[PDB]
Design a protein around this ligand. Sequence first.
Ligand SMILES: [K+]
Ligand SMILES: [Mg+2]
Ligand SMILES: [Mg+2]
Ligand SMILES: [Mg+2]
Ligand SMILES: [Mg+2]
Ligand SMILES: [Mg+2]
Ligand SMILES: [Mg+2]
Ligand SMILES: [Mg+2]
Ligand SMILES: [Mg+2]
Ligand SMILES: [Mg+2]
Ligand SMILES: [Mg+2]
Ligand SMILES: [Mg+2]
Ligand SMILES: [Mg+2]
Ligand SMILES: [Mg+2]
Ligand SMILES: [Mg+2]
Ligand SMILES: [Mg+2]
Ligand SMILES: [Mg+2]
Ligand SMILES: [Mg+2]
Ligand SMILES: [Mg+2]
Ligand SMILES: [Mg+2]
Ligand SMILES: [Mg+2]
Ligand SMILES: [Mg+2]
Ligand SMILES: [Mg+2]
Ligand SMILES: [Mg+2]
Ligand SMILES: [Mg+2]
Ligand SMILES: [Mg+2]
Ligand SMILES: [Mg+2]
Ligand SMILES: [Mg+2]
Ligand SMILES: [Mg+2]
Ligand SMILES: [Mg+2]
Ligand SMILES: [Mg+2]
Ligand SMILES: [Mg+2]
Ligand SMILES: [Mg+2]
Ligand SMILES: [Mg+2]
Ligand SMILES: [Mg+2]
Ligand SMILES: [Mg+2]
Ligand SMILES: [Mg+2]
Ligand SMILES: [Mg+2]
Ligand SMILES: [Mg+2]
Ligand SMILES: [Mg+2]
Ligand SMILES: [Mg+2]
Ligand SMILES: [Mg+2]
Ligand SMILES: [Mg+2]
Ligand SMILES: [Mg+2]
Ligand SMILES: [Mg+2]
Ligand SMILES: [Mg+2]
Ligand SMILES: [Mg+2]
Ligand SMILES: [Mg+2]
Ligand SMILES: [Mg+2]
Ligand SMILES: [Mg+2]
Ligand SMILES: [Mg+2]
Ligand SMILES: [Mg+2]
Ligand SMILES: [Mg+2]
Ligand SMILES: [Mg+2]
Ligand SMILES: [Mg+2]
Ligand SMILES: [Mg+2]
Ligand SMILES: [Mg+2]
Ligand SMILES: [Mg+2]
Ligand SMILES: [Mg+2]
Ligand SMILES: [Mg+2]
Ligand SMILES: [Mg+2]
Ligand SMILES: [Mg+2]
Ligand SMILES: [Mg+2]
Ligand SMILES: [Mg+2]
Ligand SMILES: [Mg+2]
Ligand SMILES: [Mg+2]
Ligand SMILES: [Mg+2]
Ligand SMILES: [Mg+2]
Ligand SMILES: [Mg+2]
Ligand SMILES: [Mg+2]
Ligand SMILES: [Mg+2]
Lengths: 149, 126, 50, 207, 119
Amino acid sequence: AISKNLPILKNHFRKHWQERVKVHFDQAGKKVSRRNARATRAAKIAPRPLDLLRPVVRAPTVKYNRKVRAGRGFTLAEVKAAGLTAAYARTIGIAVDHRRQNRNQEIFDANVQRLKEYQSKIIVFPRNGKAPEAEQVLSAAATFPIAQP
Amino acid sequence: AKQSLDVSSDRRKARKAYFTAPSSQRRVLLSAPLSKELRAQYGIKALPIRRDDEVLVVRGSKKGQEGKISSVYRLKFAVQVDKVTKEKVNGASVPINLHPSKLVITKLHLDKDRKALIQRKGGKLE
Amino acid sequence: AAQKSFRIKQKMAKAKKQNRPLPQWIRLRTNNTIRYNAKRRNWRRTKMNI
Amino acid sequence: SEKAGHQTSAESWGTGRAVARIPRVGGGGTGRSGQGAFGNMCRGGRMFAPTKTWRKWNVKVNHNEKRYATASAIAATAVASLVLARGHRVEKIPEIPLVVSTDLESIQKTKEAVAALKAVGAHSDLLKVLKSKKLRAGKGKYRNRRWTQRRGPLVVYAEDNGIVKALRNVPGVETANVASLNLLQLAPGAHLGRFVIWTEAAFTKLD
Amino acid sequence: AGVKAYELRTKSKEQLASQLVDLKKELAELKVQKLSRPSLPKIKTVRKSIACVLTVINEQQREAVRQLYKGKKYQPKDLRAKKTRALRRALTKFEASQVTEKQRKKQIAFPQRKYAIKA
RNA sequence: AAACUUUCAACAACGGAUCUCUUGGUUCUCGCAUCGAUGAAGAACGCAGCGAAAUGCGAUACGUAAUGUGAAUUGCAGAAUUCCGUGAAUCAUCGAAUCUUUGAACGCACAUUGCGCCCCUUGGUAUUCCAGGGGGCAUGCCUGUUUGAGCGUCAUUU
RNA sequence: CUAUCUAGCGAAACCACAGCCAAGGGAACGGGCUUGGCAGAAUCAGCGGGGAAAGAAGACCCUGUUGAGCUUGACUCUAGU
RNA sequence: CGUGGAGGUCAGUGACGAAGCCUAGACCGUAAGGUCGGGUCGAACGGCCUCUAGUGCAGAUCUUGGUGGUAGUAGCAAAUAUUCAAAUGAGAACUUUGAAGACUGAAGUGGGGAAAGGUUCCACGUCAACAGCAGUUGGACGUGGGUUAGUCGAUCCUAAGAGAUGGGGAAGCUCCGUUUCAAAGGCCUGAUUUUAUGCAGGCCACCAUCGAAAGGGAAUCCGGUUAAGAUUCCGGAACCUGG
RNA sequence: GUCGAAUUUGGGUAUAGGGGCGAAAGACUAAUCGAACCAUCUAGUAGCUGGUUCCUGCCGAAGUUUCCCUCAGGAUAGCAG
RNA sequence: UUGACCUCAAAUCAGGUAGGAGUACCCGCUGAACUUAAGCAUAUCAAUAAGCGGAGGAAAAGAAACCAACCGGGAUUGCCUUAGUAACGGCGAGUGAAGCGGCAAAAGCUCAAAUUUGAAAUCUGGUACCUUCGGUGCCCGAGUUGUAAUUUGGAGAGGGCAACUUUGGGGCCGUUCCUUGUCUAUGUUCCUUGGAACAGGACGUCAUAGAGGGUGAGAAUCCCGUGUGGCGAGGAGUGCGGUUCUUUGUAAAGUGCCUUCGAAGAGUCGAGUUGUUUGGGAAUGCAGCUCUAAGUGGGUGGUAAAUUCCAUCUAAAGCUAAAUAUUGGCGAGAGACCGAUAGCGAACAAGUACAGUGAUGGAAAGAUGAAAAGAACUUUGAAAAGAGAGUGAAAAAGUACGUGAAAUUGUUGAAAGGGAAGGGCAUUUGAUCAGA
Ligand SMILES: [K+]
Ligand SMILES: [Mg+2]
Ligand SMILES: [Mg+2]
Ligand SMILES: [Mg+2]
Ligand SMILES: [Mg+2]
Ligand SMILES: [Mg+2]
Ligand SMILES: [Mg+2]
Ligand SMILES: [Mg+2]
Ligand SMILES: [Mg+2]
Ligand SMILES: [Mg+2]
Ligand SMILES: [Mg+2]
Ligand SMILES: [Mg+2]
Ligand SMILES: [Mg+2]
Ligand SMILES: [Mg+2]
Ligand SMILES: [Mg+2]
Ligand SMILES: [Mg+2]
Ligand SMILES: [Mg+2]
Ligand SMILES: [Mg+2]
Ligand SMILES: [Mg+2]
Ligand SMILES: [Mg+2]
Ligand SMILES: [Mg+2]
Ligand SMILES: [Mg+2]
Ligand SMILES: [Mg+2]
Ligand SMILES: [Mg+2]
Ligand SMILES: [Mg+2]
Ligand SMILES: [Mg+2]
Ligand SMILES: [Mg+2]
Ligand SMILES: [Mg+2]
Ligand SMILES: [Mg+2]
Ligand SMILES: [Mg+2]
Ligand SMILES: [Mg+2]
Ligand SMILES: [Mg+2]
Ligand SMILES: [Mg+2]
Ligand SMILES: [Mg+2]
Ligand SMILES: [Mg+2]
Ligand SMILES: [Mg+2]
Ligand SMILES: [Mg+2]
Ligand SMILES: [Mg+2]
Ligand SMILES: [Mg+2]
Ligand SMILES: [Mg+2]
Ligand SMILES: [Mg+2]
Ligand SMILES: [Mg+2]
Ligand SMILES: [Mg+2]
Ligand SMILES: [Mg+2]
Ligand SMILES: [Mg+2]
Ligand SMILES: [Mg+2]
Ligand SMILES: [Mg+2]
Ligand SMILES: [Mg+2]
Ligand SMILES: [Mg+2]
Ligand SMILES: [Mg+2]
Ligand SMILES: [Mg+2]
Ligand SMILES: [Mg+2]
Ligand SMILES: [Mg+2]
Ligand SMILES: [Mg+2]
Ligand SMILES: [Mg+2]
Ligand SMILES: [Mg+2]
Ligand SMILES: [Mg+2]
Ligand SMILES: [Mg+2]
Ligand SMILES: [Mg+2]
Ligand SMILES: [Mg+2]
Ligand SMILES: [Mg+2]
Ligand SMILES: [Mg+2]
Ligand SMILES: [Mg+2]
Ligand SMILES: [Mg+2]
Ligand SMILES: [Mg+2]
Ligand SMILES: [Mg+2]
Ligand SMILES: [Mg+2]
Ligand SMILES: [Mg+2]
Ligand SMILES: [Mg+2]
Ligand SMILES: [Mg+2]
Ligand SMILES: [Mg+2]
């Protein structure tokens, strides 16, 4: 079946491919469901920004090391230098990453600084006080955006 | 012009629900409007028809004829009114099935539950 | 076989009891799309296969 | 159904039996036995090329091309001849486009919203509906598409202060936010010239 | 109009057993009558009355046994709650809320705090 | 010239196309998580005043109890119309029961409606025979109890 | 005893359309075509010349990069030993 | 050009009759087709601009259904054979009774049974279909009635064999094996009778179960009785087993 | 043909599909046998046979070249739109 | 002789548990061939179908013996990419991942190895009582061949000094969620047609309701509903908001510095070979057999090996929600889908009737009418039925029922006809008909 001057094609449809065909008809339903889940999770948790504060971090693989991006969690060193314990930071909404290590003083200082800014821009409600309802803001990432140095 | 996700505008589902409605739902499906006098006296517009209600036919070939409900034939989705009948060729008489939406109730059959229903719908003076 | 097990005789009894035409007061019911006994069996036409 | 037509063990009888070679239901005793199966020409068989869900249903359109079409439809709403050609009984109506006071956005009641539309002259286009309502021809009428009617005016606002609810019960009338103008409403049936009633705030937000 | 369970419930088990015996005698004589009389629907009422009396007798007996077994563990299985088999196999609320001393200490010390962003 | 054959029309047939219907299917989306030794799914047989089925139900058998509604059910018959009521209904709901013989199926069997054993009780003088009523007797495994076995083995008497 | 005729009952095979020939030419053996011979309703019993009659997508032969049964130091393996 | 469905429009058509169908009636188009009249009919449907496809049939030994010619044709001819009269009935070659003539000729066309069937048995009513003619008759149709056991069978035994357990194999569904490498036992009783049991005297175990309506096997006969049951019911007369 | 023993036969029982069973015919194994039946893989593949549904208008062929496990097929060039 | 211990038994011992079903999705095992390669064996189909074992509402995976080689990222999963690419492949046909990057969702952890040794501090069960998803007392037992507390590599522990900071559960009512009940607008005004008005015309009303359905024809306004709100009922649960008794506790946790330490899993890693598998290529995973480690060790770093470094993790033990799947179950909303030969096989007493020994195979079959008003009565006939009468808007709707095509058929009418018929051009004749 080798016809006129056409590129060689590599269409991989020699298995029972029609048994596994995922048409995403539910794209709009799933978007509505994700928004509903976000709304109920925001209403369920205390006034709390729906996500943990993430550190700034350099992407690997020189294709991407020129840019900076959100990481998993703040290192133990960064949390200690910001003046918190890892357990208490995890309870007050900071992601902590015991695996990541600091070999770059720029990134370390930036993460300590955004931890300090977070501590100065959050109000922690006492367990046995009043702490009047404080107008939950849904995004910590929007409040503390990652800036490219 | 429906807004809630729990109501269906599907004609097939609506017709299935209507035709398979049990007797208790058919009672409500077979409501009849009150007459002008009864609407004024009770302050309510319509009521599920009952076996001893007095009604006036306002539509059909029997328009203007009056009588007392003989039976609420819920299975047939119809009511039967005494002295509104069909005379057969053999001399017998058979009731004419009428739909309560084509009648007006001219005198309610009242009891404790009917009075409570009036007052729950917003009826004045029982 | 005239020496039959009770199970066989019981199935025979059920078949005898259900070997009847449609009750004629059915076909008077309100909607009644039923016209006749469509499951009628006869010993000369279809065997019970026990 | 992916299994429709194939829920049988039919095999061809082969040649030599004076019948076509289409596969045939085996067994006996029922009338279905010996009948052709699996063929698009066979009663109770599988249709030719059974329809599949992974047919392409939605169509991608370049965002800029979609905005070109929307801008063209908006501009066409200002040409009285196009609006007249597209039904839209605007004959004894003042200058097109028709811009009304921003007070329209705050009307809460259908009665006063209809009165405002009549006062600004959309009465004939409202009466076009309520008179064009006809039973749909064909099988669509028992597929939840029982009735058809014309399109009335598209009222465009900048802020919804009750006009949307006040107008949603008026047949044929549609309401749109000026921020999100629908091409499906601005050129119904791909026909330019929708009769549009702009509030003043919407008209000034168009720029 | 047949018997009423709420009237039967005020009667002792002896009266209920006697009423059951009379209802059985009545049903026997009614099915004797049915052989001659055509279309005798009165037997349905006696059948339902026998069912109601048996229901009330069983209600009283089961209530007495529940009283006998009140409070102590190991009730009879047909008096225990019939949830699903998996639900009866599931951990109780006390279990699956059991926590180690270490876990109790650490979750007392560091619970999820309530905190809002205020800028 | 009839008869006959053929063609067309009208009316009548045969047949069930077409059209219009649609409590059905099909596909998409959304939500939820709940079978069974407390005996499931499935099966057999029965149950109604008059039913063969479908549906429902289990000798309490188209059902009992409970709750709600508030006057039916309806093919006939019957009942009832107190029905201003703890109350009609082939109603809805359903939390209490019943749930034949089975079935993973559990005393042993089962091409048998075959054959045991134990306990309580009743009758026939009746612990032993016969019968009736009620309640029980499967396997693997776990924790525990009790009774045991082995020069496997410790100590004491010896 | 059928066949035959009658009363009653009542199928199937098969059927492009159909049915008189001779020669011609033609896919080289026509019911149709050409040229002639001719040609008169509706039919019954027989008959086996013809319908290259029916029955079956030739079983022989060939082709297929279609098989299968069987065999053998064909190729490649394998249970067992 | 035409078809099903979709967006728009003609504020299109329509119970004063939509669609469909019929119509050697009319008109338009080269044509695909379109339009009109008349009849029938009864609830929807169309023109135009676009969208979309499960979109157009003469064939496929095409599929399903229906219908022909063949054709009132082939045929309804094995098993010796029917006939007369009466009755019944609307109707009799076929039903019933009587008369006659025949046959099966006891290795039966007789009387019973096993397998199988399952009510076909019997009575009453009864002929639309079925009984390849007929039908008043029937193994049909409709409604009912009917099968009575200590002694006849099953039930029990083992046969070829089937097959749990103990064990072993197998990823596993399961397989092997049937007394095997198993701690596989109840039935007896001195005493105990704090209770005929536990301790506590003593006797016997190479082993589930299924497998025969013809093998083995406890014991019943005669007479009468029904529309239809009989070694079963009734009468009489026995027998066996357990106690 | 044979008809008193390598006899005939009932019931029970065992052997199951590359398996059984065969006093051997490739016989028989439920009208199925040189590999049963049932369902699924499976709408198996087919260079081979058959069919392939509206109108009009314009243009309009090839059976030749080369290569192929190629010779009833394809690629390629040519002819055509 | 007595009393243990260990191991092994028995009991219709006390209390429990497993089986089977479903099986769309999920975790494994086992495992083809048709097919493609224009033949065919490796390959492909396919790590698929069939077979087997095992779960849940999801499962699995999951907090690195990871990826990387960067200025380093940081559990798992899923999407868009990477990418039809690196690579595999009679290097033929074919096959074919992963890192980064963007996003959805986010969540973290716990055992073993430690002397409590100035006190087995631990736990099942039985029993009595209670405020009963449990608690307390008592008593057996389990357990030192190790049950608690303490630690989990990010650490952490034992000692010394310094202080500071923080805290537990049940009540009542809300709230959140689930299952439910009920109430909440406006014409049956007039005219015409019609059997029926729900049609057309006129005049109105409500509209946060002109979705949908019913009612004798197209009904916002006749009925149910719809829209918008109100008022209840029964639960689940502490998610969180208040009120109040409690007051936990000189108990528990965190934090600085100094010092000594710092246990970290074996027939396992790894190696050889065999088979399978993978894109994994001197061998990607898996498994069998043989060999069999170490502790500044070990694994990985995608070309075998020796040597020297480096980088990165920490196996051979374990738990974990969401984002993800879902031709099954339950409950909902929909469609440019099909409209009774279609759509599921089944719109209907359909997995039914029926066939087969069996595994299995498996149909056909919807529509009178608004309402039975389902044809009283007369007459002919043995009867079926006919003719009348009648009901009905219609019997050109009579249950052999909406419409009622064609094939095929009867009757009537017309016409033609010597071994076919049908057709084309043209005209005669007859019949019929439009146009001005
Ligand atoms: K062969
Ligand atoms: Mg026979
Ligand atoms: Mg189909
Ligand atoms: Mg149409
Ligand atoms: Mg049960
Ligand atoms: Mg000739
Ligand atoms: Mg010649
Ligand atoms: Mg010829
Ligand atoms: Mg000639
Ligand atoms: Mg002639
Ligand atoms: Mg001849
Ligand atoms: Mg001849
Ligand atoms: Mg051939
Ligand atoms: Mg052939
Ligand atoms: Mg070749
Ligand atoms: Mg071969
Ligand atoms: Mg279509
Ligand atoms: Mg018409
Ligand atoms: Mg014609
Ligand atoms: Mg109609
Ligand atoms: Mg097609
Ligand atoms: Mg055709
Ligand atoms: Mg053709
Ligand atoms: Mg044909
Ligand atoms: Mg045919
Ligand atoms: Mg003849
Ligand atoms: Mg003959
Ligand atoms: Mg003869
Ligand atoms: Mg005689
Ligand atoms: Mg003789
Ligand atoms: Mg003789
Ligand atoms: Mg007889
Ligand atoms: Mg006959
Ligand atoms: Mg006859
Ligand atoms: Mg009979
Ligand atoms: Mg005997
Ligand atoms: Mg075995
Ligand atoms: Mg036996
Ligand atoms: Mg014997
Ligand atoms: Mg007899
Ligand atoms: Mg006797
Ligand atoms: Mg040979
Ligand atoms: Mg095909
Ligand atoms: Mg030309
Ligand atoms: Mg070559
Ligand atoms: Mg050819
Ligand atoms: Mg026990
Ligand atoms: Mg394939
Ligand atoms: Mg090939
Ligand atoms: Mg090929
Ligand atoms: Mg081949
Ligand atoms: Mg599978
Ligand atoms: Mg579950
Ligand atoms: Mg989930
Ligand atoms: Mg999990
Ligand atoms: Mg770790
Ligand atoms: Mg990661
Ligand atoms: Mg690319
Ligand atoms: Mg692969
Ligand atoms: Mg600590
Ligand atoms: Mg209302
Ligand atoms: Mg209507
Ligand atoms: Mg480790
Ligand atoms: Mg494998
Ligand atoms: Mg791990
Ligand atoms: Mg896990
Ligand atoms: Mg169908
Ligand atoms: Mg029809
Ligand atoms: Mg009509
Ligand atoms: Mg008709
Ligand atoms: Mg015709």
